[PDB]
Amino acid sequence: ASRLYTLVLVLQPQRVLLGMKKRGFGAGRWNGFGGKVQEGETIEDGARRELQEESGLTVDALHKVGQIVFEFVGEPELMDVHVFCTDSIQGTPVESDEMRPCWFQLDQIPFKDMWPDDSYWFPLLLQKKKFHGYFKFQGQDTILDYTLREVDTV
Ligand SMILES: Nc1nc(NC2CC2)cc(N2CCOCC2)n1
């Protein structure tokens, strides 16, 4: 059994947009925009809503780029994160009570201030390859196991 989450990376030819999470789960780390998928909305719908909520941005089209399953030791539910990509954004990103958005050059991505798994799968995101990932965490900092592969269908 797993719970659905979304994650949205606005990835342009020279830069990626990230947000500093100000409260809640993952506070103090840069990440893409996303969160819990709600009852009554598609996964992509949930992805658009969290992007609008956390950055004010809306998007013409979202593209499926990956799926990452997380297990946390001692927690019965798995985290199933659907990762989306997009180039063209509508609007200017602005701080919310969840996220302080900033653009990053692609050689200055702050992996040390991100979730530790991102160092593993973000490269596949940059090569525009679809991927499936699995990470077993102890706490929120320690990866104990992981698998990562390229897929033809996310
Ligand atoms: N890039 C990334 N790495 C994560 N690592 C797992 C917590 C250990 C979680 C996560 N998000 C989870 C919540 O919804 C947004 C995506 N995003």
Swiss-Prot record:
The lineage of its organism: Eukaryota, Metazoa, Chordata, Craniata, Vertebrata. Changing L148A: Reduces 2-oxo-dATPase and 8-oxo-dGTPase activities and increases thermolability. Changing V81M: Decreased localization to mitochondrion. 2-oxo-dATP binds at T6, N31, F33, G34, G35, K36, W115, P116, D117, D118. Residues 1-130 form the Nudix hydrolase domain. A motif (Nudix box) lies at residues 35-56. Changing V37E: Loss of activity. Keywords: Cytoplasm, Hydrolase, Magnesium, Metal-binding, Mitochondrion, Nucleus, RNA-binding, Transit peptide. Changing A47P: Loss of activity. CDD domains: NUDIX_MTH1_Nudt1. It holds the Pfam family NUDIX. Its EC number is 3.6.1.56, 3.6.1.-. The gene is NUDT1. Widely expressed with highest expression in thymus, testis, embryo and proliferating blood lymphocytes. It comes from Homo sapiens (Human). One of its GO terms (molecular function) is 2-hydroxy-dATP hydrolase activity. Changing E53G: Loss of activity. Mg(2+) 1 binds at G34, E54, E98. Binds 2 Mg(2+) ion per subunit. One of its GO terms (biological process) is DNA protection. Inhibited by 2-oxo-dADP and 8-oxo-dGDP. GO terms for cellular component: cytoplasm; cytosol; mitochondrial matrix; mitochondrion; nucleus. Changing E150A: Reduces 2-oxo-dATPase and 8-oxo-dGTPase activities and increases thermolability. 8-oxo-ATP binds at F25, F33, G34, G35, K36, E50, E54, W115, P116, D117, D118. Belongs to the Nudix hydrolase family. It catalyses: 2-oxo-dATP + H2O = 2-oxo-dAMP + diphosphate + H(+); 2-oxo-ATP + H2O = 2-oxo-AMP + diphosphate + H(+); 8-oxo-dGTP + H2O = 8-oxo-dGMP + diphosphate + H(+); 8-oxo-dATP + H2O = 8-oxo-dAMP + diphosphate + H(+). 8-oxo-dGMP binds at T6, K21, N31, W115, P116, D117, D118. This is Oxidized purine nucleoside triphosphate hydrolase.
